[PDB]
Amino acid sequence: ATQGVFTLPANTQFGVTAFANSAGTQTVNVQVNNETVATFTGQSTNNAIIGSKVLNSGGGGKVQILVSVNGRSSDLVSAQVILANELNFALVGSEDSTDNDYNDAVVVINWPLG
Amino acid sequence: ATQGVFTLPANTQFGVTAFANSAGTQTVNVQVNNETVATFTGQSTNNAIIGSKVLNSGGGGKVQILVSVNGRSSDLVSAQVILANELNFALVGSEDSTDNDYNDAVVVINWPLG
Amino acid sequence: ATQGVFTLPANTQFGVTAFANSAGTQTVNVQVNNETVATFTGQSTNNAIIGSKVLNSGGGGKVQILVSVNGRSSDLVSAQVILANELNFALVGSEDSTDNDYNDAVVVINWPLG
Amino acid sequence: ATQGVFTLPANTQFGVTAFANSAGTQTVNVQVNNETVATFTGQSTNNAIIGSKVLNSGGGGKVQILVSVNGRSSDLVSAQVILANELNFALVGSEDSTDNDYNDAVVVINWPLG
Numbered sequence: 001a002t003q004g005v006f007t008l009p010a011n012t013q014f015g016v017t018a019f020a021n022s023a024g025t026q027t028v029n030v031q032v033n034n035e036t037v038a039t040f041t042g043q044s045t046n047n048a049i050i051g052s053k054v055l056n057s058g059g060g061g062k063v064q065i066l067v068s069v070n071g072r073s074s075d076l077v078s079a080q081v082i083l084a085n086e087l088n089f090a091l092v093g094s095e096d097s098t099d100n101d102y103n104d105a106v107v108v109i110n111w112p113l114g
Numbered sequence: 115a116t117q118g119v120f121t122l123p124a125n126t127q128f129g130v131t132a133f134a135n136s137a138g139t140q141t142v143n144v145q146v147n148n149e150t151v152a153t154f155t156g157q158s159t160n161n162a163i164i165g166s167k168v169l170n171s172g173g174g175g176k177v178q179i180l181v182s183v184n185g186r187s188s189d190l191v192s193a194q195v196i197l198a199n200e201l202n203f204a205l206v207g208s209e210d211s212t213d214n215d216y217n218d219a220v221v222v223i224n225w226p227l228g
Numbered sequence: 229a230t231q232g233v234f235t236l237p238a239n240t241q242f243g244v245t246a247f248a249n250s251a252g253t254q255t256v257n258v259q260v261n262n263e264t265v266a267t268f269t270g271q272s273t274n275n276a277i278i279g280s281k282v283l284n285s286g287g288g289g290k291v292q293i294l295v296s297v298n299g300r301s302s303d304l305v306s307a308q309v310i311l312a313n314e315l316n317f318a319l320v321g322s323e324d325s326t327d328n329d330y331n332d333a334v335v336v337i338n339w340p341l342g
Numbered sequence: 343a344t345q346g347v348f349t350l351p352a353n354t355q356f357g358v359t360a361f362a363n364s365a366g367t368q369t370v371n372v373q374v375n376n377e378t379v380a381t382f383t384g385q386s387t388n389n390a391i392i393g394s395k396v397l398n399s400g401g402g403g404k405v406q407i408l409v410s411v412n413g414r415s416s417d418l419v420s421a422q423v424i425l426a427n428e429l430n431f432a433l434v435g436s437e438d439s440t441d442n443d444y445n446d447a448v449v450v451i452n453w454p455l456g
């Protein structure tokens with residue numbers, strides 16, 4: 001299945017936060033309605049935050065996360081969870097190698113804000 | 115039901131990250147086996163990160179999140195989600211008032227690291 | 229927090245299924261847009277299915293689950309999970325006594341159908 | 343990523359339930375510790391239950407779901423959710439064709455029982 005794609009409510013603010021856990025330098029691309037709106041880059045094996053931004057989901061509400069290491073696409077896993085019928089998390093893990101820890105770049109999307 | 119309490123595997127590194135979305139100044143306490151090991155305080159209506167740390171779950175693996183505003187306990191909601199049978203997220207929302215957005219402090223715990 | 233309340237897309241067919249794991253006879257009340265549309269009743273300590281129905285979410289999309297045992301309200305816990313940005317589960321556990329297993333009646337709501 | 347594989351606690355009773363939403367006849371295979379312990383075969387476009395059983399997770403706790411239609415493997419998506427630090431759901435969707443509804447066979451695994 002395609003992973004890392006989420007439909008948000010339109011024209012809504014969301015937070016996006018990326019964490020690194022790999023020897024490889026991670027590149028996280030955030031696409032909103034098929035246009036790049038953020039790129040995060042960094043390296044850590046200790047969960048460093050390599051980016052955190054507030055973005056808007058625009059008309060279509062389509063948010064897509066892509067992760068690459070030195071231009072090679074990582075394999076993604078994802079899900080959305082809603083708490084109290086209001087608080088939303090869109091969650092992405094990514095795997096750059098063989099150990100299947102899926103934490104090499106971790107991306108958390110949250111909404112609503114404010 | 116009690117919320118904000120999670121059993122992690124023992125002696126395991128995990129990340130904890132807190133975001134604020136409220137007029138009220140948020141205090142997030144992180145307890146590991148009933149000892150307060152991190153405290154984050156801050157105010158934002160725009161999802162600012164008010165704390166991020168790497169901790170160890172210790173022998174019992176018990177991680178508890180408590181949130182207060184001006185000394186009053188916020189109401190909590192929480193769940194754990196596991197992706198690819200390996201990547202864990204323990205998620206907490208909190209409500210300090212009446213609107214039931216549950217985002218007033220948001221806490222994300224992730225493991226494994228590295 | 230209020231639990232057992234979910235917003236579905238409008239005018240959508242969904243499934244609701246209840247399981248029992250308790251000495252007590254469970255009564256599961258299902259409301260769509262604040263009107264009762266189903267009642268499931270049954271007793272099992274071995275996960276028997278006590279009801280399964282297909283319903284429509286109507287104009288408002290509001291679905292609420294309440295659980296009681298001999299007229300006493302059970303404590304509820306809930307969350308919604310979305311897989312592949314399409315497949316929805318709304319999940320309820322309930323606690324009728326003191327052991328905090330939250331499985332006394334378990335309700336699974338799924339959509340889309342067909 | 344591999345999907346449909348879950349680690350349960352050892353020697354634990356769990357429920358497995360399958361629903362069908364497809365023109366195609368679904369075959370759901372359930373393995374516990376790499377041995378087939380149930381096969382559900384059925385057809386519905388309206389969320390009928392095509393199997394429900396109580397099984398034991400054995401020493402290894404490994405539960406795997408596979409879904410096929412006329413011998414061809416469906417694409418799987420999955421996740422595990424824990425409520426109240428106690429109530430577990432392991433969730434599977436499957437896609438047998440091209441519409442990406444992921445509901446063609448839906449499998450819900452729940453524990454604890456009793």
Ligand SMILES: OC[C@H]1O[C@H](O[C@@H]2[C@H](O)[C@@H](O)O[C@H](CO)[C@H]2O)[C@@H](O)[C@@H](O)[C@@H]1O
Binds near residue numbers: 137212214215
């Ligand atoms: O005070 C907690 C509260 O802050 C934010 O809401 C604001 C306050 O209620 C107050 O300043 O009134 C404002 C409207 O005039 C309102 O925006 C929200 O983040 C709310 O969720 C939070 O609980």
Ligand SMILES: OC[C@H]1O[C@H](O[C@@H]2[C@H](O)[C@@H](O)O[C@H](CO)[C@H]2O)[C@@H](O)[C@@H](O)[C@@H]1O
Binds near residue numbers: 251325329332
């Ligand atoms: O009574 C509801 C309760 O039922 C099941 O526990 C049982 C009861 O407490 C009573 O029948 O005593 C039995 C032996 O002590 C006990 O198993 C459980 O399903 C429990 O979760 C439920 O709340």
Ligand SMILES: OC[C@H]1O[C@H](O[C@@H]2[C@H](O)[C@@H](O)O[C@H](CO)[C@H]2O)[C@@H](O)[C@@H](O)[C@@H]1O
Binds near residue numbers: 364366387437438
């Ligand atoms: O065949 C699997 C498919 O079944 C259901 O879609 C139907 C079939 O494509 C076929 O019978 O044509 C029908 C009308 O065109 C169509 O509804 C769906 O459940 C689909 O999700 C599933 O993959």
Ligand SMILES: OC[C@H]1O[C@H](O)[C@@H](O)[C@@H](O)[C@@H]1O
Binds near residue numbers: 098
């Ligand atoms: O290939 C990079 C590699 O670096 C580290 O060894 C680990 O974090 C692995 O999970 C990661 O995949």
Ligand SMILES: [Ca+2]
Binds near residue numbers: 099104
């Ligand atoms: Ca890895």
Ligand SMILES: [Ca+2]
Binds near residue numbers: 021022101103104
């Ligand atoms: Ca890693």
Ligand SMILES: [Ca+2]
Binds near residue numbers: 208210211214
């Ligand atoms: Ca609030």
Ligand SMILES: [Ca+2]
Binds near residue numbers: 113114135136215
């Ligand atoms: Ca708020």
Ligand SMILES: [Ca+2]
Binds near residue numbers: 324330331
């Ligand atoms: Ca109970």
Ligand SMILES: [Ca+2]
Binds near residue numbers: 329331332455456
């Ligand atoms: Ca019980």
Ligand SMILES: [Ca+2]
Binds near residue numbers: 440446
């Ligand atoms: Ca399909």
Ligand SMILES: [Ca+2]
Binds near residue numbers: 443444445
């Ligand atoms: Ca289908």
